[PDB]
Design a protein around this ligand. Structure first.
Ligand SMILES: CO[C@H]1O[C@H](CO)[C@@H](O)[C@H](O)[C@H]1O
Ligand SMILES: CO[C@H]1O[C@H](CO)[C@@H](O)[C@H](O)[C@H]1O
Ligand SMILES: [Ca+2]
Ligand SMILES: [Ca+2]
Ligand SMILES: [Mn+2]
Ligand SMILES: [Mn+2]
Lengths: 48, 181, 181, 48
């Protein structure tokens, strides 16, 4: 079991629009690799 | 109160609740962003727009996403460029490819991009990546040059489990990637 | 496994995760299908397609939905036509108006409609509604002529709590409506 | 409290497509009324 964690402060409200779309992206250039996703779950809660 | 959730443990050949761009498509129960070919880009987005913050009250949403991804390279020395989970404007198309990972267009802060991304970068781009040259996890804000990074040792062909969570109370974005071995 | 969920307790003026048709729009924290005007239609759909059944496995989804609706007529005796919750093809568009509720085109069974709806019918259409003339809740399958109905007493301007559930093990669709008093 | 209940057997698989959109509809004719929705939640689960 090998884990890696990273954290930082991001003021979402100042960066993204009120409504957004979420997703994945992957690219290759002069060098490459296959990029795959096997499963995905998402949950968001906006109170008020 | 507004909440949005979804779970997909196995993808279908016709996953209509996803939007595919570039080389992106589903097959063999998996979501393929790119095959092992040069100079290409693939993206997949959730169909429904998400309400991440409220103009009226100024409230911001808490959210958590978890996924399992695999990078299959021909070898362990020549790998590029990487993969990201991103949050962007509703009607977004693929941005610059290559080291820009299809979500940014420069290493300088561009407020019009309005995109936050968590990158899993496998290729050292001299102009902006950490000088140590290590592969790394990074948090990107309107720029390909991360605000923070963490050296990451890629396990070729292995399943990486990722959890990305955002705490609205503290504005902290946390990322964790776990390999079983 | 594939799940889809959402909750909206307060509607925003520009509710981007909804698709509007006819005169549907959001105002004062609520979703307005129609105003107290003559000859009109309004529909609102969740933007994301839902995976209800799978041909590969043959499995069918279990689902539950809850909503609170209000019908405000000028007169508690001069009301029409009604309201429905429906399930239809991804590209669904408004159908016939009036007593057809914007979801069907005939009383005759039409397999191509591919629509299942639960109606809250407030106006007696002699050609197909229960002969007792009562306002009623009905389950419609490819037709405006309900497969089963239950007499219902409309409470003008009062909030009604509805729960519609489908059990895939028995193919049973249940509807329940409750008024505060 | 005034409650009404109704149920019936509907074989969804034979009526609707594999993929669908859900929503509300309302109409008026010679007679009319405002139709409004104040809240809405939904949850579906497809085993696989
Ligand atoms: C040699 O540089 C090229 O290939 C690398 C690796 O694929 C990309 O990061 C970069 O954008 C592209 O210009
Ligand atoms: C008088 O008939 C008209 O008005 C009623 C009630 O509004 C609708 O049911 C019907 O379709 C329309 O033709
Ligand atoms: Ca890079
Ligand atoms: Ca009627
Ligand atoms: Mn980087
Ligand atoms: Mn009827």
């Amino acid at each position: 079991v090998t884990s890696y964690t990273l954290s930082d402060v991001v003021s979402l409200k100042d960066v993204v629009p009120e409504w957004v779309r979420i997703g994945f992206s992957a690219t290759t250039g002069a060098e490459y690799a296959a990029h795959e996703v096997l499963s995905w779950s998402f949950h968001s809660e906006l109170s008020g | 109160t507004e909440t949005t959730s979804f779970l997909i443990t196995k993808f279908s050949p016709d996953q209509q609740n996803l939007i595919f761009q570039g080389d992106g498509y589903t097959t063999k129960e998996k979501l393929t962003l790119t095959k092992a070919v040069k100079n290409t880009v693939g993206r997949a987005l959730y169909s429904s727009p998400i309400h991440i913050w409220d103009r009226e009250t100024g409230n911001v949403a808490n959210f958590v996403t978890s996924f399992t991804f695999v990078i299959n390279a021909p070898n362990s020395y020549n790998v590029a460029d990487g993969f990201t989970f991103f949050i962007a404007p509703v009607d977004t198309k693929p941005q610059t490819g290559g080291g820009y990972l299809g979500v940014f267009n420069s290493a300088e802060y561009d407020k019009t991009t309005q995109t936050v991304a968590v990158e899993f970068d496998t290729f050292y781009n001299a102009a902006w990546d950490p000088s140590n040259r290590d592969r790394h996890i990074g948090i990107d804000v309107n720029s390909i040059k991360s605000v923070n990074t963490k050296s990451w040792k890629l396990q070729n062909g292995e399943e990486a489990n990722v959890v990305i969570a955002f705490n609205a109370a503290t504005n902290v974005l946390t990322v964790s990637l776990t390999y079983p071995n």
